């Protein structure tokens, strides 16, 4: 046995292209649409819960994931790749930061660590790149609210608002017209639901849409009282009912 | 670990990777070595395709391995740094364990051995570098000039050149260099080295580097003006 693939599977072609990264980006293009919008007092991330079968319980499959109490993530592309990246991202937030500094990492540095993991899958021996693009929304004390995109290459960019996957080109155009620097969080949620309706074919309700926010601190979700400085997680996943309420005022 | 055999024999008994490494040397800038009666001179070509260069900080072509030995090269520049570092480490290791500085022959044998090792080790390619190693042994006044190449073979030379258009300058040296009476002085040795490079270089401005090594760790690099005076005198005699 032994892993005898100690050589790179991603290499430069004569034209300068890294083929496997391009092909990974093509897989991301085929994936279901997801988006993110940044407001003055929050960030929203959203996607469609594309259920593979009606017998399948789509509540058990979480496309939007908590990484830290103040950082959340959503993806487009290959689901299994995303699931393992979330596991690694959650762990690296502890091992490379929280266990050292005693606090959760700021958004940009956690993004930097995830990016590194994805870059290594693009150069290390005997592996293919991750077939996902991530959208990571988060908050921290000194940088405020922020939204980042991470690609299969490991490259990451900060966005005011953006979209990835199936109908990203049309969705990004829609967001350019609606976005301004004075948006409140509720306005951003409203715009997110409008943008996402264009890329969805079938049912459009709280059960087929997954949406989460980075906003105010939630002391009711903390689970304990007694420490003034601990005020609760800023990440919150909107319920099926909470989504439907905002679809009536749509 | 990556164990792949990159340097292997072909049906006609050739190791192509080693032979392709010699092609990288052929592409490299010209380097020349000439030993006089009491000195050795190392000449090096600088391609003038690169101007706006900062000549203060740009890596010089001739490298000191120890206070009494120098090394110039032709081929891949990045590869040469690895050999030079290894040679420098070995030079200090020899002083440390044997309480004498390396002989020029010993240092050459080490560098050549490193080059050979990279022609039959798994997962590595040969060095695309040929070197000219020159200097004087400790407490000796006999000039030493050696050459190495990617295959790992080495040998001593009265005068030798490597790199691009080395065929032309070797032709010049073969008819101009007399073994019975070598360049008696430093001037004659430098003049012959500059003359040989002028067959290939193009302009005699900032394209020629000269480094003179004398006995007892006396090593100095000539400046642009000093070299330019040689270039002037050579062509003025040529107009006849």
């Amino acid at each position: 046995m032994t892993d005898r693939y100690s050589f790179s599977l991603t290499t430069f072609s004569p034209s300068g292209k890294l083929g496997q990264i391009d092909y990974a980006l093509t897989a991301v293009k085929q994936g279901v649409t997801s988006l993110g919008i940044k407001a003055t007092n929050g960030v929203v991330i959203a996607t469609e819960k594309k259920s593979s079968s009606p017998l399948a319980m789509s509540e058990t499959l979480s496309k939007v994931s908590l990484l830290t109490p103040d950082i959340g993530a959503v993806y487009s592309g290959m689901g299994p790749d995303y699931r393992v990246l979330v596991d690694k991202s959650r762990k690296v937030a502890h091992t490379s930061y929280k266990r050292i500094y005693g606090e959760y990492p700021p958004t940009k540095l956690l993004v930097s660590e995830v990016a590194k993991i994805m870059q290594e899958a693009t150069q290390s021996g005997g592996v293919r790149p991750f077939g996902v693009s991530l959208l990571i929304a988060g908050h921290d004390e000194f940088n405020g609210f922020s939204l980042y995109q991470v690609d299969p290459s490991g490259s990451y960019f900060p966005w005011k608002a953006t979209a990835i996957g199936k109908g990203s080109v049309a969705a990004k155009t829609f967001l350019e017209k609606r976005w301004n620097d004075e948006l409140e969080l509720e306005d951003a949620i409203h715009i997110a639901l409008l943008t996402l309706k264009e890329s969805v074919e079938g049912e459009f309700n709280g059960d087929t849409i997954e949406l989460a926010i980075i906003g105010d601190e939630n002391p009711d979700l903390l689970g304990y009282t007694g420490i003034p400085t601990d005020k609760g997680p800023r990440f919150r996943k909107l319920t099926s009912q909470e989504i439907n309420d905002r679809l009536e005022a749509l | 670990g990556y164990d792949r055999a990159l340097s292997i024999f072909s049906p006609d008994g050739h190791i192509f990777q080693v032979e392709y490494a010699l092609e990288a040397v052929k592409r490299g800038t010209c380097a020349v070595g000439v030993k006089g009666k009491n000195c050795v001179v190392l000449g090096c070509e600088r391609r003038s395709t690169l101007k706006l260069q900062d000549t203060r900080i740009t890596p010089s072509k001739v490298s000191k391995i120890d206070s009494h030995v120098v090394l110039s090269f032709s081929g891949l520049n990045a590869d040469s740094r690895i050999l030079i570092e290894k040679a420098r480490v070995e030079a200090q290791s020899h002083r440390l364990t044997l309480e004498d500085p390396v002989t020029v022959e010993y240092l050459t044998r080490y560098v050549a051995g490193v080059q050979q090792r990279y022609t039959q080790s798994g997962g590595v390619r040969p060095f695309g570098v040929s070197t000219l190693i020159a200097g004087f042994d400790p407490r000796d006044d006999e000039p030493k000039l050696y050459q190495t190449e990617p295959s790992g073979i080495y040998s001593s030379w009265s005068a030798q050149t490597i790199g691009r258009n080395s065929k032309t300058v070797r032709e010049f040296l073969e008819k101009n260099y007399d073994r019975k009476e070598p360049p008696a002085t430093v001037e004659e040795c430098v003049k012959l080295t500059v003359r040989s490079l002028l067959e290939v270089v193009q302009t005699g401005a900032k394209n020629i580097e000269i480094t003179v090594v004398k006995p007892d760790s006396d090593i100095v690099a000539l400046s642009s003006e000093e070299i330019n005076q040689y270039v002037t005198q050579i062509e003025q005699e040529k107009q006849e």
Binding site: - | A5, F9, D12, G13, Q116, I153, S156, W157, Q160
Partner: protein, 235 residues
């Protein structure tokens, strides 16, 4: 591509057979064994007149009682010589005696097939290992990159090998003197060499019980060349 340790349909290792082709391109080396000693001679083959020929070292001492000549990719021989010298001296450490020529040769040949995917390829050099010991007397061995070694009364390796071997077939007899063997190596080298044989482009050496392994001076070889010319002109 294909494995480095692959057999051909004829039952030969591709790489070993290809390394033998590299040895055919090498400079000529000849060895002759007599009851008075073993003689080793080589073609230096300088690529240019500016190359100082005395730095070309194709004949090498392994121990006082064992010498060695090489042909092929000579850079590959350095680690083999190093191993041989270590093996010879190590045996002297463990057993307080000289090592048998055959045992030394066997130790060198054990390295040969240590290649795969250890070193990445076989050696591209053949060795003539000559020496003397108390048990089997004066001996000459031919060590190949296949791991095989044959003992020889006389042997030539390199570019002019098959032409030289046919000449050694006729000339060798069991009563050869050392002086006769010296002239015989010079004769056959002069025959297969491209350039004209002299003291600067050819080198002689021998191994005797009394004096041990010796590389001949250029002044000493020059006289043997002059002695050869006169005896050929004598008839």
């Amino acid at each position: 591509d294909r494995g480095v340790s692959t057999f051909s349909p004829e039952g030969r290792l591709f790489q070993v057979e290809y390394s033998l082709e590299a040895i055919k391109l090498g400079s000529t080396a000849i060895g002759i064994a007599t009851k008075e000693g073993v003689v080793l001679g080589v073609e230096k083959r300088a690529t240019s007149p500016l190359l100082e020929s005395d730095s070309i070292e194709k004949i090498v001492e392994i121990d006082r009682h064992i010498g060695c000549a090489m042909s092929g990719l000579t850079a590959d021989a350095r680690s083999m010589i190093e191993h041989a010298r270590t093996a010879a001296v190590t045996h002297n450490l463990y057993y307080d005696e000289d090592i048998n020529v055959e045992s030394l040769t066997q130790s060198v040949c054990d390295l040969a097939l240590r290649f795969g995917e250890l070193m990445s390829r076989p050696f591209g050099v053949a060795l003539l290992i000559a020496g003397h010991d108390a048990d089997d007397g004066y001996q000459l061995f031919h060590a190949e990159p296949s791991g095989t070694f044959y003992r020889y009364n006389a042997k030539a390796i390199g570019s002019g090998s098959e032409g030289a071997q046919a000449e050694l077939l006729n000339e060798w007899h069991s009563s050869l003197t050392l002086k006769e063997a010296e002239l015989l190596v010079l004769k056959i080298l002069k025959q297969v060499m491209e350039e004209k044989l002299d003291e600067n482009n050819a080198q002689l050496s021998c191994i005797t019980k009394q004096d041990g392994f010796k590389i001949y001076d250029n002044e000493k070889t020059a006289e043997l060349i002059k002695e050869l010319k006169e005896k050929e002109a004598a008839e």
